[PDB]
Design a protein around this ligand. Structure first.
Ligand SMILES: *[C@@H]1O[C@H](CO)[C@@H](O[C@@H]2O[C@H](CO)[C@@H](O)[C@H](O)[C@H]2NC(C)=O)[C@H](O)[C@H]1NC(C)=O
Ligand SMILES: *[C@@H]1O[C@H](CO)[C@@H](O[C@@H]2O[C@H](CO)[C@@H](O)[C@H](O)[C@H]2NC(C)=O)[C@H](O)[C@H]1NC(C)=O
Ligand SMILES: CO[C@]1(C(=O)O)C[C@H](NC(C)=O)[C@@H](NC(C)=O)[C@H]([C@H](O)[C@H](O)CO)O1
Ligand SMILES: CO[C@]1(C(=O)O)C[C@H](NC(C)=O)[C@@H](NC(C)=O)[C@H]([C@H](O)[C@H](O)CO)O1
Ligand SMILES: CO[C@]1(C(=O)O)C[C@H](NC(C)=O)[C@@H](NC(C)=O)[C@H]([C@H](O)[C@H](O)CO)O1
Ligand SMILES: CO[C@]1(C(=O)O)C[C@H](NC(C)=O)[C@@H](NC(C)=O)[C@H]([C@H](O)[C@H](O)CO)O1
Ligand SMILES: *[C@@H]1O[C@H](CO)[C@@H](O)[C@H](O)[C@H]1NC(C)=O
Ligand SMILES: *[C@@H]1O[C@H](CO)[C@@H](O)[C@H](O)[C@H]1NC(C)=O
Ligand SMILES: *[C@@H]1O[C@H](CO)[C@@H](O)[C@H](O)[C@H]1NC(C)=O
Ligand SMILES: *[C@@H]1O[C@H](CO)[C@@H](O)[C@H](O)[C@H]1NC(C)=O
Ligand SMILES: *[C@@H]1O[C@H](CO)[C@@H](O)[C@H](O)[C@H]1NC(C)=O
Ligand SMILES: *[C@@H]1O[C@H](CO)[C@@H](O)[C@H](O)[C@H]1NC(C)=O
Ligand SMILES: *[C@@H]1O[C@H](CO)[C@@H](O)[C@H](O)[C@H]1NC(C)=O
Ligand SMILES: *[C@@H]1O[C@H](CO)[C@@H](O)[C@H](O)[C@H]1NC(C)=O
Ligand SMILES: *[C@@H]1O[C@H](CO)[C@@H](O)[C@H](O)[C@H]1NC(C)=O
Ligand SMILES: *[C@@H]1O[C@H](CO)[C@@H](O)[C@H](O)[C@H]1NC(C)=O
Ligand SMILES: *[C@@H]1O[C@H](CO)[C@@H](O)[C@H](O)[C@H]1NC(C)=O
Ligand SMILES: *[C@@H]1O[C@H](CO)[C@@H](O)[C@H](O)[C@H]1NC(C)=O
Ligand SMILES: *[C@@H]1O[C@H](CO)[C@@H](O)[C@H](O)[C@H]1NC(C)=O
Ligand SMILES: *[C@@H]1O[C@H](CO)[C@@H](O)[C@H](O)[C@H]1NC(C)=O
Ligand code: NA
Ligand code: NA
Ligand SMILES: [Zn+2]
Ligand SMILES: [Zn+2]
Lengths: 369, 369
């Protein structure tokens, strides 16, 4: 009786879900498909006011790239069912001889910070960050490929009067109107190039730091790897850490190569008593390559991870949308449960065959009578 | 039935207590006092092998000062009953016109890091940290008063050939043999002085950073305050942050004033599934001044704080040792409890009048039947 259920759910109506096409009731198509057949989410929840979901997008994608959706929502119990729209299938690298594995590392670090913080705050949104820069140089899109253009962090070009990239540069940015801010601090970790026409032996070791002008605390990232931009010595790409910062005026200081600074932040608002987030595995049908970086990110005590036992097997829309087992996993959002724990959700508050571990809510005992 | 108990306890025999005189069975006195009358700990636990406690000491005191006890112990459920041996009663400042409130801030930040980490590791000890320094200058005891001498971090003197303190200096240190290390990164935040004979208008703005040579990550602290070393402009003292670092070779870089680096670290070993620490309020009889910095440090989800409802009222030894209510609070270490939660310990695993919140162990229900 009352065994843990492999679902995501909620203790009361104070919940919120962040998603992609599989939770996006506003997507439109014109064909002979059944209505809303791309959904894993139950159509009854489309008008709940508790969903922020966009076909083709993810939190990581909107945070870093020009393909932007303003994910926003507030709840005590926060659930995520997204991530797949930045995966190894996309194969993103900043440069021709870059490394998607670095980008998978970035994915894991971003989601780990996000989940940790969303166990402690009710409200999430994505805000623009402005800068003040004393020179005439403008932003440059150093990191992109044929389908995605990175725009966070911003990279400022070299000033015209400088002959090389061995310069110090800086700009200030303001973080205002949120309790905490997640921003990226990144570096090209390796031997960077100014231009293709430069001598083979001239390269740069990118350095970047952010400095709080009031408190005087700074966090920094220097290049240490031997990887580069050529076929002979490949592997250079953009490594990012994700910092949780208090409101204030900040100084971005670059000691070598291009200045970078945040253009977007995750805005965190309204502290709550600690409540773990729930994360649903977000993957393709195995005809495409997926990753487990959200699983790497989802750790105790701040996150509970839920997954099915099968390939993602689309019903009518295509192979990648409308899976029976993910539909059943999400069906727990249709009702309240007594307790949400590591093993799953416990429907009833009284007795179970299994002891809940890391239980939240009104949890049952597994004692006799 | 089975209401939460205001005690510290354990789920099984896999527990450990860090303490001071009130848990130290090895202290000796020669008088007409009853045997072991300074203890709050039950004498039955003196030979348990689960206690690391020293009269006159605390974790913070041994971490920072020459009055050192090698606190060491391992357990799944970790309990702390210490802290009072660095308090406002001691009135410690690095300098004549310093600020004990800065030192209380340091106390809170140290214990917050320690409690957080001891919810995630079984084993704690204090290890020495060595350095490599390319100059001839030796350590100097810049921070002390009439009863305490700070020795962590170490401060290296100016080289003889330098005329002033506007120099860059560095030294490397190795962290080896632990899974993680807590070390202090500190700065004199204000207008520092080279010497009393210097012109009134010459002062220094202390800067310090630690840099991981392999990964290239650095963490830094610059001076920003206007406080100083004189009666006219007082308040300068040593502000410290407490960093959790992985094993490796590190570089301490000082851009101004004296170079500082770790001489001691908290050695963290043996990852465990998340289990909150229990902290007992550590204060004097109110004839002396206490602080609540361990309470500020003890936050959810990593720590449960326990306190009595009375002044600390010593029985026979003196006013500061052997309190009835603290004796009863610690008596929970004599037996196992089913569940340890935010409200207190629940003895039985089946039913209670109260729903456990943030429960660990085999927790009861408050449902009917
Ligand atoms: C991080 O990288 C920067 C940029 O290369 C380093 O700054 C230079 O360091 C070298 C020697 O260490 C000096 O010769 C340069 O004059 C420094 N400044 C500039 C503006 O180039 C910086 O030292 C590195 N950080 C650490 C902690 O080693
Ligand atoms: C932290 O403080 C150090 C030491 O004062 C700063 O280093 C100096 O900065 C000024 C201008 O910002 C330069 O004129 C000096 O030449 C710098 N170097 C040295 C060795 O004095 C450092 O800039 C401060 N950090 C930040 C992020 O502002
Ligand atoms: C090419 O792949 C994507 C896209 O990159 O936008 C992925 C979307 N999937 C998710 C999970 O967000 C997919 N949406 C649906 C309803 O099929 C869309 C959609 O097929 C196209 O925008 C229109 O065909 O395409
Ligand atoms: C496309 O390849 C590269 C190159 O290897 O030359 C990548 C460089 N980026 C890094 C991180 O090493 C890029 N540098 C700048 C400052 O834009 C240069 C540059 O854009 C071009 O060579 C044009 O000068 O191009
Ligand atoms: C002066 O205060 C202290 C000390 O600074 O060491 C505090 C000790 N208290 C704690 C809680 O650790 C106290 N211990 C006992 C058993 O009385 C000792 C002790 O009185 C002296 O070492 C010997 O009298 O003195
Ligand atoms: C005792 O007072 C002070 C002072 O104000 O002169 C404190 C200084 N410390 C700070 C942090 O400002 C100290 N400086 C050094 C480098 O030792 C000097 C110095 O020891 C003496 O003046 C002897 O030169 O003394
Ligand atoms: C996103 O929505 C939030 C909530 O209204 C808002 O504060 C924020 O400025 C928006 N961001 C962008 C980039 O439109
Ligand atoms: C950035 O802030 C610093 C410190 O307050 C200031 O000195 C500097 O002038 C600012 N930068 C710009 C471009 O205004
Ligand atoms: C993610 O996948 C890798 C490679 O298969 C594996 O080593 C790792 O344990 C996985 N992590 C999680 C949390 O599932
Ligand atoms: C989820 O389950 C599928 C099928 O069992 C498996 O391929 C996938 O690796 C699992 N996800 C994670 C993050 O381990
Ligand atoms: C993908 O989805 C289809 C259709 O649901 C399913 O039959 C198949 O098992 C899945 N996997 C692969 C590799 O085709
Ligand atoms: C969930 O509980 C709330 C009260 O906390 C109630 O308003 C709501 O109707 C419940 N939801 C369902 C689907 O029964
Ligand atoms: C709960 O367990 C205790 C200890 O065995 C017992 O005294 C009590 O009767 C039990 N209560 C119920 C409702 O089973
Ligand atoms: C403290 O004890 C531990 C455990 O034996 C040991 O590893 C460490 O080196 C000791 N530290 C000092 C400073 O004696
Ligand atoms: C400290 O390490 C750095 C980087 O590996 C090295 O360049 C430097 O020589 C070392 N310092 C000393 C004093 O050996
Ligand atoms: C500590 O004491 C201060 C001053 O009385 C008070 O403002 C603060 O709330 C206290 N904090 C805790 C956690 O008890
Ligand atoms: C513990 O209780 C005493 C007496 O009620 C009180 O003075 C003290 O401030 C309490 N401790 C904290 C940390 O609040
Ligand atoms: C301190 O301890 C004594 C002796 O136990 C007790 O009577 C008194 O109430 C306590 N407080 C003060 C301020 O003396
Ligand atoms: C606590 O439980 C353990 C078994 O987990 C047992 O060995 C021990 O005797 C118990 N302690 C007491 C004081 O009963
Ligand atoms: C637990 O609660 C459910 C729902 O009311 C009920 O069906 C069941 O009989 C209860 N079990 C016990 C032992 O009270
Ligand atoms: Na840079
Ligand atoms: Na310094
Ligand atoms: Zn369709
Ligand atoms: Zn005595």
């Amino acid at each position: 009786f009352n065994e843990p259920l492999n679902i995501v759910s909620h203790l009361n109506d104070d919940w919120f879900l962040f998603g992609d096409a599989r939770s996006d009731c506003t997507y439109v198509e014109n064909n002979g498909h059944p209505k809303l057949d791309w959904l894993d989410l139950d159509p009854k929840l489309c008008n709940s006011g508790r969903i922020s979901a966009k076909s083709g997008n993810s939190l990581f994608r909107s945070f870093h790239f020009t393909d932007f959706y303003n994910y926003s929502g507030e709840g005590d119990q926060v659930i995520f069912y997204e991530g797949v729209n930045f995966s190894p299938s996309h194969g993103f690298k900043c440069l021709a001889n870059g490394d998607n594995k670095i980008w998978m590392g970035n994915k894991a670090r971003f989601y780990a910070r996000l989940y940790e913080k969303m166990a402690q705050y009710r409200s999430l949104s994505i805000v623009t960050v402005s800068y003040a820069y004393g020179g005439n140089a403008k932003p440059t899109s150093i990191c992109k490929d044929n389908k995605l253009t990175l725009n966070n962090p911003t990279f400022i070009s070299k000033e015209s009067n400088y002959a090389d990239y061995y310069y110090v540069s800086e700009a200030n940015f303001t973080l205002q109107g949120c309790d905490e801010f997640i921003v990226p601090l990144c570096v090209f970790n390796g031997h960077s190039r100014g231009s293709s026409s430069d001598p083979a032996n001239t390269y740069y070791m990118d350095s970047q730091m952010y400095y709080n002008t009031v408190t005087g605390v700074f966090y920094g990232f220097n290049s240490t790897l031997d990887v580069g931009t050529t076929v002979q010595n490949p592997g250079l790409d953009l490594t990012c850490s994700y910092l949780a910062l208090s409101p204030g005026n900040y100084k971005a200081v670059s000691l070598e190569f291009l200045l970078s600074l945040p253009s977007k932040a995750i805005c965190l608002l309204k502290p709550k008593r600690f409540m773990p987030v729930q994360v649903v595995d977000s993957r393709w049908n195995s005809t495409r390559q997926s990753d487990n970086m959200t699983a790497v990110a989802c750790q105790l005590p701040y996150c509970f991870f839920r997954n099915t036992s099968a390939d993602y097997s689309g019903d009518t829309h295509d192979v990648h949308h409308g899976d029976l087992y993910f539909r059943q996993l999400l069906s727990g959002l249709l009702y309240n449960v007594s307790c949400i724990a590591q093993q799953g959700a416990f429907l009833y508050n009284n007795v179970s065959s299994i002891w809940p571990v890391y239980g939240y809510g009104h949890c049952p005992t597994a004692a006799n009578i």
